Short mmCIF file of C-alpha atoms and ligand atoms in Angstrom, two decimals:
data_model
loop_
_atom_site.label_atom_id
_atom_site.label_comp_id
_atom_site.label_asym_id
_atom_site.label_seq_id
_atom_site.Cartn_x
_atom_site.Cartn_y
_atom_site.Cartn_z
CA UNK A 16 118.45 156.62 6.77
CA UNK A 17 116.40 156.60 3.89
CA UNK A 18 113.20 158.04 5.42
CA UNK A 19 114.97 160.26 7.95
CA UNK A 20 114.11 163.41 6.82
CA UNK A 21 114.17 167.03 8.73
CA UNK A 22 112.50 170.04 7.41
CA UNK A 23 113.49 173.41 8.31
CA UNK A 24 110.10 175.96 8.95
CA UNK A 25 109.26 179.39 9.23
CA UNK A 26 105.85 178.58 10.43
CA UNK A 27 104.25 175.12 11.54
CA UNK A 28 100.94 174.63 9.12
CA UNK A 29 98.14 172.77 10.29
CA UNK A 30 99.45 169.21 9.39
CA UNK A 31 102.48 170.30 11.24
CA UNK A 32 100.64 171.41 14.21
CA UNK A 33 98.87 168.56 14.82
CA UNK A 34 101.84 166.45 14.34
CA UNK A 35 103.41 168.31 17.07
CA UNK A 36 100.41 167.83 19.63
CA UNK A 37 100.76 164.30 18.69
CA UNK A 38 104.65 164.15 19.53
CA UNK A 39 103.76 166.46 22.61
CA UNK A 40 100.75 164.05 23.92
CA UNK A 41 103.52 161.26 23.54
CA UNK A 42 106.26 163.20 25.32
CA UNK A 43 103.85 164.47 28.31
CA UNK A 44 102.16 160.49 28.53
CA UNK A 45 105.94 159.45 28.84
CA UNK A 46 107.90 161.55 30.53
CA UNK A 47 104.82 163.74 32.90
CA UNK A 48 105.73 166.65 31.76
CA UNK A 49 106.95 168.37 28.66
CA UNK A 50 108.74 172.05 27.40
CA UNK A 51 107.30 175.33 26.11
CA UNK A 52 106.70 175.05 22.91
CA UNK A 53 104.33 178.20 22.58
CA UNK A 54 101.72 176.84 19.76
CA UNK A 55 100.80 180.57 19.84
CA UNK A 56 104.21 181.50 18.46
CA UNK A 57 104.81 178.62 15.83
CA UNK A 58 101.33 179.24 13.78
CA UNK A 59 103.06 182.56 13.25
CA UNK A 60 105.60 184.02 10.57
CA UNK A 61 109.08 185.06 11.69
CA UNK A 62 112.63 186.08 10.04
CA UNK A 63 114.46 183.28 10.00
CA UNK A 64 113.12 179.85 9.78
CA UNK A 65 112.21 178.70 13.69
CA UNK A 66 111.47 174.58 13.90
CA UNK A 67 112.94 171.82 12.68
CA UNK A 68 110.87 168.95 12.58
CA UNK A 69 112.62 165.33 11.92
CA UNK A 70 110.54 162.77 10.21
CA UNK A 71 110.86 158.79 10.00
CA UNK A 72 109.00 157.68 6.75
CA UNK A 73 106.52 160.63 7.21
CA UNK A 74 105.91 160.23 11.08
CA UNK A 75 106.95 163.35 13.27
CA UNK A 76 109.72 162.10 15.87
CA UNK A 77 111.43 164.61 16.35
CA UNK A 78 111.62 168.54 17.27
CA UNK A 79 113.40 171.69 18.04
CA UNK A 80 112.00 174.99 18.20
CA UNK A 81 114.09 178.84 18.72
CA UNK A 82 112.77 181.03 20.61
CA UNK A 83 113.67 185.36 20.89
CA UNK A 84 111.54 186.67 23.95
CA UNK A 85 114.32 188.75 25.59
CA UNK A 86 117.24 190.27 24.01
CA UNK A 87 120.24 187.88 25.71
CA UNK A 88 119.29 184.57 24.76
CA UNK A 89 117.44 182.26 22.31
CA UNK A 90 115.01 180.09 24.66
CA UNK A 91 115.57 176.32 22.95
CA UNK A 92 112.46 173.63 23.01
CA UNK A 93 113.54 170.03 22.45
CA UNK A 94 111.41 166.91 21.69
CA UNK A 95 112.10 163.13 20.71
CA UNK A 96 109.36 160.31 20.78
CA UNK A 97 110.48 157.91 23.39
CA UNK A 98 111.22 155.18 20.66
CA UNK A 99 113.92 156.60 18.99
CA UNK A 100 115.74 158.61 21.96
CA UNK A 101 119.59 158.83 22.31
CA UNK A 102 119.68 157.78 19.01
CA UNK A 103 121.36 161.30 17.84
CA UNK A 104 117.92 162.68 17.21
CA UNK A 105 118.56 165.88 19.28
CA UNK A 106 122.05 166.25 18.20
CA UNK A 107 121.06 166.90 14.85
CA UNK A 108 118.77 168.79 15.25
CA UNK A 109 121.04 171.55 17.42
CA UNK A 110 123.16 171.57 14.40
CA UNK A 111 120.40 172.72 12.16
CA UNK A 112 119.40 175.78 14.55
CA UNK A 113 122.74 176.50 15.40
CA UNK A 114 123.89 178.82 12.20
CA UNK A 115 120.33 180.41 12.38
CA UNK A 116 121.12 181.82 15.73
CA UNK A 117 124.55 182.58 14.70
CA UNK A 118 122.64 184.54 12.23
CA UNK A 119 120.80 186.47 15.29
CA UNK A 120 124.05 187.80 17.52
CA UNK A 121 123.01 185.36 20.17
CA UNK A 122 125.23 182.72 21.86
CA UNK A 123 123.34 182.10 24.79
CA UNK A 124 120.36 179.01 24.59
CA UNK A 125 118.52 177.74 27.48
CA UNK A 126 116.65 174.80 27.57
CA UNK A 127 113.42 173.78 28.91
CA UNK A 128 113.59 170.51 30.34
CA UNK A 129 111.10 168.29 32.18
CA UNK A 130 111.91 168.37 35.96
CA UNK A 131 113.92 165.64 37.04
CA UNK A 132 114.36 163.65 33.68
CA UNK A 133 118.26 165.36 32.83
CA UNK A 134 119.61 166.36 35.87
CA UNK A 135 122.40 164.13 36.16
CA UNK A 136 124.12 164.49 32.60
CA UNK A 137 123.01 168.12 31.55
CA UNK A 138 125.12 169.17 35.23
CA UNK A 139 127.90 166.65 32.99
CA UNK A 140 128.24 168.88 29.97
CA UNK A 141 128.46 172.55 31.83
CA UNK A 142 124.76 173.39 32.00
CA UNK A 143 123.68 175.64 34.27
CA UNK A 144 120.64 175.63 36.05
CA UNK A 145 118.43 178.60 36.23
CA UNK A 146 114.98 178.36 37.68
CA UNK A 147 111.71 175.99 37.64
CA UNK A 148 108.42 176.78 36.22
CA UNK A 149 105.53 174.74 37.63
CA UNK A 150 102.04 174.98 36.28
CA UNK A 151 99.85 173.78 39.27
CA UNK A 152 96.31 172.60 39.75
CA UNK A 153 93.13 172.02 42.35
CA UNK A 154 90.25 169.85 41.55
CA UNK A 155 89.37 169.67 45.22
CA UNK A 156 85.66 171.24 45.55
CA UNK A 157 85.83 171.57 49.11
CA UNK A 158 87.08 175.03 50.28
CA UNK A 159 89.55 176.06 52.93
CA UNK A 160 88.58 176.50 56.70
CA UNK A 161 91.70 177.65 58.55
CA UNK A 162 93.90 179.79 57.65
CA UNK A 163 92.29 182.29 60.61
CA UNK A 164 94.62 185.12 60.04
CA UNK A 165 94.60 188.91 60.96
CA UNK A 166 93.72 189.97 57.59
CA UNK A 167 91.06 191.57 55.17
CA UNK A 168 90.99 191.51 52.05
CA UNK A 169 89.45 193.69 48.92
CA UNK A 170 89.17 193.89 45.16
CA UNK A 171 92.39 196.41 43.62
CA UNK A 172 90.74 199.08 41.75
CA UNK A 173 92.97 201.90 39.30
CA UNK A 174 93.65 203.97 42.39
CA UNK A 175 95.81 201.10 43.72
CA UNK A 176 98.67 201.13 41.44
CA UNK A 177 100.96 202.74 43.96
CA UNK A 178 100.30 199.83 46.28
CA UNK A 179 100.50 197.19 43.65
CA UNK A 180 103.56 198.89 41.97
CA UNK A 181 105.29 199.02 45.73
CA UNK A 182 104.53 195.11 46.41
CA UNK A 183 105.87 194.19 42.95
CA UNK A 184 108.94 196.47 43.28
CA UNK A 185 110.33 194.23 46.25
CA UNK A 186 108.47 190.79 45.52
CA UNK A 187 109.43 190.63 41.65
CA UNK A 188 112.55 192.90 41.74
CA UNK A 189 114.32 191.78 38.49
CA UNK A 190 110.41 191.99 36.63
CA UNK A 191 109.35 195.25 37.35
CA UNK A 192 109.87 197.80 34.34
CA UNK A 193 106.46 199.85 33.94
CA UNK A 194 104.61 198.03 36.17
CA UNK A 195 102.37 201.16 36.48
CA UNK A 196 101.25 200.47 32.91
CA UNK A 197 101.05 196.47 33.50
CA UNK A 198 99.14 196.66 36.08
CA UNK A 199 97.17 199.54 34.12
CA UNK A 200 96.52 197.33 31.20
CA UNK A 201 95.67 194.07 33.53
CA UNK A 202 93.09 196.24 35.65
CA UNK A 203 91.18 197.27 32.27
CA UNK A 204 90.69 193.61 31.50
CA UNK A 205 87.55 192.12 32.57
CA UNK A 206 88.92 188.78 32.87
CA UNK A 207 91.30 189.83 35.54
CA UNK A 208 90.89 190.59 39.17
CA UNK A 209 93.27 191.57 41.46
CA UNK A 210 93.10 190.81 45.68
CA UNK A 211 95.03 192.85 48.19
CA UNK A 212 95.53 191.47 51.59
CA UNK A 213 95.28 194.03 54.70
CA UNK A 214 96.95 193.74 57.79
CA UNK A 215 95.76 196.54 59.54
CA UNK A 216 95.34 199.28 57.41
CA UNK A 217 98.40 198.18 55.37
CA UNK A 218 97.96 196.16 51.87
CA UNK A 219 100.32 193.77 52.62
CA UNK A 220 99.76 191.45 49.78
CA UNK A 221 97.86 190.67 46.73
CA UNK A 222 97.21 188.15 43.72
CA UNK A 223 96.29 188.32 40.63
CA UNK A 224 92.90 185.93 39.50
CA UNK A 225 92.61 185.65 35.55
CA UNK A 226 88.86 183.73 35.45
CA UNK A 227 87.40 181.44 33.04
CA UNK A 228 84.30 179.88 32.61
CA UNK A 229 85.08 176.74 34.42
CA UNK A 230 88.45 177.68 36.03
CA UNK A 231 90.93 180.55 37.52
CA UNK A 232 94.42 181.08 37.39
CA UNK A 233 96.05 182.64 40.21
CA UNK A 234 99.45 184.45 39.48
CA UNK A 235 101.41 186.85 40.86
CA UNK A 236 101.07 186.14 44.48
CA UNK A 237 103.26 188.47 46.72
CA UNK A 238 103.69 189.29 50.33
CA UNK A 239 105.70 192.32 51.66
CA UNK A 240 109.11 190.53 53.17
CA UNK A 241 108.73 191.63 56.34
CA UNK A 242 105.24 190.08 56.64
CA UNK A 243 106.79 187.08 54.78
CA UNK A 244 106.68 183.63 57.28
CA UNK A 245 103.49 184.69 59.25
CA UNK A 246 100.93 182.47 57.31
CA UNK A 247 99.52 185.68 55.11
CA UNK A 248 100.43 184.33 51.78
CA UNK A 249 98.38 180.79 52.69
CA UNK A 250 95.52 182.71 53.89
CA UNK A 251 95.76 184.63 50.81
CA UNK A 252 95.68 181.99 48.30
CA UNK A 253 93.05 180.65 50.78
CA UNK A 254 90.90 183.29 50.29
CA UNK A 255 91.14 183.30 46.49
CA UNK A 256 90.54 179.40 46.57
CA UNK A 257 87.22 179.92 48.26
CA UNK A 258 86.42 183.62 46.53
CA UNK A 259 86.77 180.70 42.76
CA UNK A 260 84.91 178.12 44.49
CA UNK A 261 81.90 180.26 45.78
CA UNK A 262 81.33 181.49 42.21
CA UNK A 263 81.04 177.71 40.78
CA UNK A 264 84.03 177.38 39.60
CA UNK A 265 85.72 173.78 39.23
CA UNK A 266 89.44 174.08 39.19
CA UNK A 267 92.19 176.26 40.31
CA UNK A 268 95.32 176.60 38.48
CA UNK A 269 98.46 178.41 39.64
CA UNK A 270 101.86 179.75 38.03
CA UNK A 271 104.81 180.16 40.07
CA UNK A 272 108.68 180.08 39.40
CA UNK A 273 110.82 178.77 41.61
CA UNK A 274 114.55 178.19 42.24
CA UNK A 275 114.09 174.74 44.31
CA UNK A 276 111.86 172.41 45.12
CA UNK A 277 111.23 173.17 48.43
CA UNK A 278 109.25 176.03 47.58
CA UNK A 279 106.40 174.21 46.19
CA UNK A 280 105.95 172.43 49.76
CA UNK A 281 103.32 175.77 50.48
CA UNK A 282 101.03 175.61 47.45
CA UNK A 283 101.05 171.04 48.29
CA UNK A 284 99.60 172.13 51.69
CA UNK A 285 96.37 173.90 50.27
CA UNK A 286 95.35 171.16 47.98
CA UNK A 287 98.06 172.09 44.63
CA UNK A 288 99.34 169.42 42.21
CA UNK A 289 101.71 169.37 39.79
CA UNK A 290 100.51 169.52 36.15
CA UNK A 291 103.71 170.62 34.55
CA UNK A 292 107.14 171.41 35.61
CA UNK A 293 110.55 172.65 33.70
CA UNK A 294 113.39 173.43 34.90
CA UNK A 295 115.61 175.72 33.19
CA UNK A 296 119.31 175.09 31.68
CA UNK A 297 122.23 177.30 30.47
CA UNK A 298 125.34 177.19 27.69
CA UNK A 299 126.62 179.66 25.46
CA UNK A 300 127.09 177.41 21.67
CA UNK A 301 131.19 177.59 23.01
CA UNK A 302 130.28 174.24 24.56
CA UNK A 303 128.46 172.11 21.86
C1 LIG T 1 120.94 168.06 24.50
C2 LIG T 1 119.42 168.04 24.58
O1 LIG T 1 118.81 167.09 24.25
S1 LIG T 1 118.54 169.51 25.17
C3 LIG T 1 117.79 169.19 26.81
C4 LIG T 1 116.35 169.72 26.77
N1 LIG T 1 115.51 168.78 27.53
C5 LIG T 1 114.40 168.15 26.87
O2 LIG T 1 114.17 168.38 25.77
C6 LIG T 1 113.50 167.13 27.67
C7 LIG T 1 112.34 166.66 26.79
N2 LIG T 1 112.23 165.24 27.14
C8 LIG T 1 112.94 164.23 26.33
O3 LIG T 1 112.80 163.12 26.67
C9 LIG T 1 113.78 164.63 25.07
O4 LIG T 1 113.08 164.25 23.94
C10 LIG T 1 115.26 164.11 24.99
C11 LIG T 1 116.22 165.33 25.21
C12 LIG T 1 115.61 163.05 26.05
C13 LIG T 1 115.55 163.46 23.55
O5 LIG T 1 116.90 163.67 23.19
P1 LIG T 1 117.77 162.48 22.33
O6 LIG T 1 117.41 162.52 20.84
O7 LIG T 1 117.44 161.12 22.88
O8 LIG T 1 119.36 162.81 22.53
P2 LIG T 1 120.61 162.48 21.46
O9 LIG T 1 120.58 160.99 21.04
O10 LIG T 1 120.48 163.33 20.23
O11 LIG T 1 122.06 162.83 22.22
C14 LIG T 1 122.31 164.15 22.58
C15 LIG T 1 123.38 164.31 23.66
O12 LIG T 1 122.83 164.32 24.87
C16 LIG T 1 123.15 162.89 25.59
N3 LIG T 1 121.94 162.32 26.16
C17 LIG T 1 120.73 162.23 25.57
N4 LIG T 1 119.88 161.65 26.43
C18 LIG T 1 120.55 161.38 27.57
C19 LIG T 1 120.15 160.80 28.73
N5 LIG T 1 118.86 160.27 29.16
N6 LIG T 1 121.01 160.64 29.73
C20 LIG T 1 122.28 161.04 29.58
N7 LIG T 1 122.68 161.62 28.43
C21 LIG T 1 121.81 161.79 27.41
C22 LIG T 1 123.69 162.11 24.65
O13 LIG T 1 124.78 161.27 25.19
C23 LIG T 1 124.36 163.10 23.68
O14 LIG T 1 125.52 163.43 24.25
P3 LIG T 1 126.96 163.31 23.45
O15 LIG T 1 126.79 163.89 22.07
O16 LIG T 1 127.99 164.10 24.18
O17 LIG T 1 127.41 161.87 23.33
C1 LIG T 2 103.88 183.86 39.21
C2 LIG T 2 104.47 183.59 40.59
O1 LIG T 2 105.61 183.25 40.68
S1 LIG T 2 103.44 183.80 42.07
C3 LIG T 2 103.99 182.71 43.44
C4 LIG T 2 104.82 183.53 44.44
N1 LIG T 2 106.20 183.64 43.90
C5 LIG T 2 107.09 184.70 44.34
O2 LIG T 2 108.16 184.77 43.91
C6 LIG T 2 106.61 185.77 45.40
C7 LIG T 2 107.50 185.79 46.64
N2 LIG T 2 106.78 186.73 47.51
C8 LIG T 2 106.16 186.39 48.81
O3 LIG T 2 105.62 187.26 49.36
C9 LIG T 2 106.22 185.01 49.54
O4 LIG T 2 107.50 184.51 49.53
C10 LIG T 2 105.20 183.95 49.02
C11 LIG T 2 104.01 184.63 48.24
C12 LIG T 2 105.91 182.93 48.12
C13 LIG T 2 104.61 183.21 50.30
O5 LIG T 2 104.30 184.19 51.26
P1 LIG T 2 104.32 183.75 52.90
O6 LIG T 2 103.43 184.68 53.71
O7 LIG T 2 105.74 183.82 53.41
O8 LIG T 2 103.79 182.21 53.00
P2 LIG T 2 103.31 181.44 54.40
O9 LIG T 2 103.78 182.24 55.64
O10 LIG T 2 101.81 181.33 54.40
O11 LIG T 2 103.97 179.90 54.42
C14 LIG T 2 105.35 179.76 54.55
C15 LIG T 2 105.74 178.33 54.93
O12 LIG T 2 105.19 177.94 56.07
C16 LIG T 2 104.10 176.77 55.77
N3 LIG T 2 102.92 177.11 56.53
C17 LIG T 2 102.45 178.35 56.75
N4 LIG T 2 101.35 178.26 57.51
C18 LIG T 2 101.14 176.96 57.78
C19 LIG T 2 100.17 176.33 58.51
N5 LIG T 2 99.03 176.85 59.25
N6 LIG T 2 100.17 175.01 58.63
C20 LIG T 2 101.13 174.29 58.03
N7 LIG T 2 102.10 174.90 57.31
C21 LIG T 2 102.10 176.24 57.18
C22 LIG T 2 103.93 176.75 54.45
O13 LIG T 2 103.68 175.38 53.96
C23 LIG T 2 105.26 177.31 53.85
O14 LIG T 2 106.18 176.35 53.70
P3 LIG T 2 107.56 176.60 52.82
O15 LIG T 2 108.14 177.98 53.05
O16 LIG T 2 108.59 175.60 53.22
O17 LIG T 2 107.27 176.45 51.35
#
């Protein structure tokens, strides 16, 4: 008890941070995968004080982190070295950020938890699931031969935002506010490319390609739902695949949120692994 010790912070500093990563390597080598934390958001000053970091005779074991994206709910990132787990780590440390987000006018917290470690008891306590995130990956250098579809495909340009606004409107419904500026701002960016798939004459798909030197994210994948179930949306991520490949590049990497697990089974098939997934939880505070 004597060296148990948590610190309440506006802003990790660079001791803090590294700390953290340290905690976060530990976590990730443990458990495969690990929450958001956002190390973009934490080096950066905020109203009320954000993390809580517990401490065991100076060593980092422990942290939660608040998060205010949206305006119905504080997103909640929770961490414990293996070691000292169940030990009433976490517990605490809820009842630290608790009166800050009192202090806010929220009462609802998810949590991002590492698929398949808390199923069982966080179902227990009245959490509700949400959705998965899965950040995906493909080291294979050998491209994709067979996805022989109907379909061309071309490079979106400014004068496609009524096409990329319509596919976005009934692929992303709940998303979509401004897309014509979104898709504005992501078409003036020169790491971004977008690809729309053609059936016919009709764009009947397209993905979004952020490159890198050495990689490319793919994000944003949609097919019209009519045109949904024909094979379009693997020869689409196909086509990117071999479009990242061709230009040297040794890795794919893919974002896509999901409500099961069964969903994933498409993006396995052309060569995908899992690198990271979370699934999201529910509570209002009511339930501590
Ligand atoms: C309540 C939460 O912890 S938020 C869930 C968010 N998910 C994550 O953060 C996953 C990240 N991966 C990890 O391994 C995490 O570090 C954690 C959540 C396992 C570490 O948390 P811990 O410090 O070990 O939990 P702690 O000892 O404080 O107990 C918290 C409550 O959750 C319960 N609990 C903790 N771990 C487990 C577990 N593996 N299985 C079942 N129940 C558990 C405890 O019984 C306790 O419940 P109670 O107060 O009603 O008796
Ligand atoms: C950031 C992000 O979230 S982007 C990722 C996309 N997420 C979304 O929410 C967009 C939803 N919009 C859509 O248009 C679609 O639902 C998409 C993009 C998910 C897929 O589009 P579709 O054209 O329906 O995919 P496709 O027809 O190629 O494959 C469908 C199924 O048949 C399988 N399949 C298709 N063709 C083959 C084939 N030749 N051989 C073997 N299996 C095949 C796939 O494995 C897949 O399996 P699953 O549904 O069980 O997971």
């Amino acid at each position: 008890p004597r060296g148990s010790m948590i610190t309440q912070v506006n802003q990790l500093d660079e001791l803090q941070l590294k700390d953290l990563k340290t905690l976060r390597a530990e976590c990730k080598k443990n458990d495969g995968s690990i929450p958001n934390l956002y190390i973009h958001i934490l080096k950066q000053h905020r109203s009320l004080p954000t993390s809580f970091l517990y401490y065991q005779n100076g060593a980092l074991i422990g942290f939660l982190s608040i998060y205010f994206f949206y305006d119905d709910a504080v997103e909640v990132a929770v961490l414990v070295s293996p070691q000292y787990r169940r030990q009433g780590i976490a517990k605490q440390l809820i009842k630290e950020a608790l009166p800050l987000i009192k202090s806010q006018n929220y009462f609802n917290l998810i949590f991002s938890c590492p698929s398949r470690l808390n199923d069982n008891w966080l179902t227990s306590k009245g959490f509700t699931y949400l959705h998965s995130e899965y950040f995906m990956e493909r080291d294979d250098l050998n491209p994709i031969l067979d996805y022989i579809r109907p379909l061309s495909f071309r490079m979106a340009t400014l004068e496609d935002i009524p096409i990329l606004c319509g596919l976005d409107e009934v692929c992303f419904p709940d998303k979509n506010q401004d897309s014509v500026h979104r898709f504005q701002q992501i078409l003036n960016e020169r790491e971004y490319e977008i690809v729309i798939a053609m059936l016919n004459n009709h764009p009947i798909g397209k993905s979004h390609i952020r490159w890198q030197t050495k990689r490319a994210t793919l994000s944003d994948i949609a097919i019209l739902p009519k045109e949904q179930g024909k094979g379009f949306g693997s020869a689409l991520i196909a086509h990117c695949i071999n479009m990242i490949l061709s230009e040297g590049k040794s890795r794919v990497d893919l974002d896509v949120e999901t409500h099961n697990k069964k969903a994933l089974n498409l993006y396995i098939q052309l060569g995908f692994h899992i690198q990271n997934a979370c699934d999201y939880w529910s509570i209002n505070v009511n339930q501590l």
